[PDB]
Design a protein around this ligand. Structure first.
Ligand code: SAM
Ligand code: ZN
Ligand code: ZN
Lengths: 116, 298
């Protein structure tokens, strides 16, 4: 029954004014990529930074189990695109946000599937 | 000159041919720093420039390429160079990495422990090492050939590098090994490559291009390291980040290099010719199995 909720702890830590997790690995790239959220190579566009995925995953970074049976990580071995205005806290961004399963884009940050 | 727009500078052949005496390395640009792009780690920039330079060599790039990366951790607890290698290598390349200390990685598999505990059933197409012991950086002691992880690397190249494979092994003024230089003669070509972002350091990557499994030329490693220090001592390299801003042709081109399982008898001169050209890998193509020896204690 008991389970440590690390996402909640990090979000509360951020609200208390805590320093976001550092040393997320930012990649060099052309910034003319598709802009999709999680990719096999860096895909940042003009408004994004690309990061090594493992370094942006709260569970990888904190050495705790991944919050699912199977224990699989969506980020490790991949690249995560972060809006440049949010790239100060890539771990927080990936936690607080969701990828559209139709188009690969972050909902709220590139997904336009809800448009007329 | 135009060197500032290169990823770095490779040891010119004429310096390889010298017979210098070992001297203290005293770099003119020591203490200078390159202006890195905003928010970019030194080792991301450094591995990017190493891969940009590797793009100019005749690397064998098979399907299901096998790459192993030693010394991949950092005091940050992450693996910047592994992320760059993962970006550089074709999708589907198997990337294994390793370090003495624990870290989180984007590699397909990660072994924690001394490199001397690592064993692999299979052979590899590319070996990258950034292993370094800061204790070697001691100007008050004679600069002798170093053992430790360098002894492991030399054995690992001779036992587990596929014919036609390539290596990039980080050295410094004091972090070096004479047998590793001697092993460079068992490749079709070799160099010491200095990245432009870290050109104020005696760091280079010893690059053996296309492994041949036997001495092509005899290299004295004490003399060759002295040759390398002499080159660095007399050729100031201007620090440069320029090449980091052009990533359009960064990915390693998936060449589909042939992989064949040949026994020592069938390796004739025509086979060695194909190895030397980046056009053949010789190894088995079974499954990749690795392990790390655990010492059990009370
Ligand atoms: C220069 S740092 C590597 C930085 C890393 N390549 C990166 O991308 O940031 C050198 C690393 O070599 C590792 N190392 C030194 N000696 C080792 C040994 N004998 N076996 C395994 N790792 C070793 C250290 O643990 C250290 O993490
Ligand atoms: Zn993870
Ligand atoms: Zn969408």
């Amino acid at each position: 029954a008991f389970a440590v909720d690390a996402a909640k702890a990090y979000k509360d830590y951020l609200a208390s004014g805590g320093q976001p997790i550092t040393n997320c690995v930012k990649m060099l790239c052309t910034h003319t990529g598709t802009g999709q959220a999680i990719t096999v190579t860096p895909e940042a566009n003009m408004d994004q930074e690309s990061f090594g995925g493992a370094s942006c995953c709260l569970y990888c970074r904190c050495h705790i189990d991944h919050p699912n049976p199977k224990g699989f990580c969506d980020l490790k071995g991949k690249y995560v695109q972060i809006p440049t205005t949010c790239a100060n806290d890539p771990v927080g961004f990936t936690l607080k946000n969701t990828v559209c399963t139709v188009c690969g884009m972050w909902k709220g940050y590139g997904c336009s599937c809800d448009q007329l | 000159s135009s060197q500032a727009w290169q990823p770095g500078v490779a040891m010119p052949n004429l310096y390889k041919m010298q017979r210098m005496l070992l001297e203290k390395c005293d770099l003119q640009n020591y203490g200078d720093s390159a202006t890195l792009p905003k928010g970019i780690m030194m080792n991301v920039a450094k591995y990017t420039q190493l891969c940009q330079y590797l793009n100019t060599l005749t690397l064998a790039v098979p399907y299901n390429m096998r790459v192993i990366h030693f010394g991949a951790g950092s005091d940050k607890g992450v693996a910047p160079g592994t992320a760059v290698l993962r970006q550089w290598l074709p999708t589907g390349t198997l990337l294994v990495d390793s370090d003495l200390n624990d870290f989180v990685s984007d590699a397909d598999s990660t072994l924690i422990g001394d490199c001397a505990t690592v064993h692999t059933a299979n052979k590899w197409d590319l070996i990258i090492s950034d292993m370094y012991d800061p204790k070697t950086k001691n100007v008050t002691k004679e600069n002798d050939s170093k053992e430790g992880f360098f002894t492991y690397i030399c054995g690992f190249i001779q036992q587990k590098l596929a014919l036609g494979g390539s290596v990039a092994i980080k050295i410094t003024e004091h972090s070096w090994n004479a047998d590793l230089y001697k092993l460079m003669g068992h490749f079709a070509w070799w160099t010491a490559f200095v990245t432009n972002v870290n050109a104020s350091s005696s760091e280079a990557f010893l690059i053996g291009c296309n492994y041949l499994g036997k001495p092509r030329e005899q290299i004295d490693g004490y003399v060759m390291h002295a040759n390398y220090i002499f080159w660095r001592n007399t050729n100031p390299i201007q620090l440069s980040s320029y090449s980091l801003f052009d990533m359009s042709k960064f990915p390693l081109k998936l060449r589909g290099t042939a992989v064949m399982s040949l026994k020592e008898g069938q390796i004739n001169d025509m086979i060695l010719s194909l190895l030397s050209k980046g056009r053949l890998i010789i190894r088995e193509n079974n499954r990749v199995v690795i392990s790390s020896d655990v010492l059990v204690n009370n």
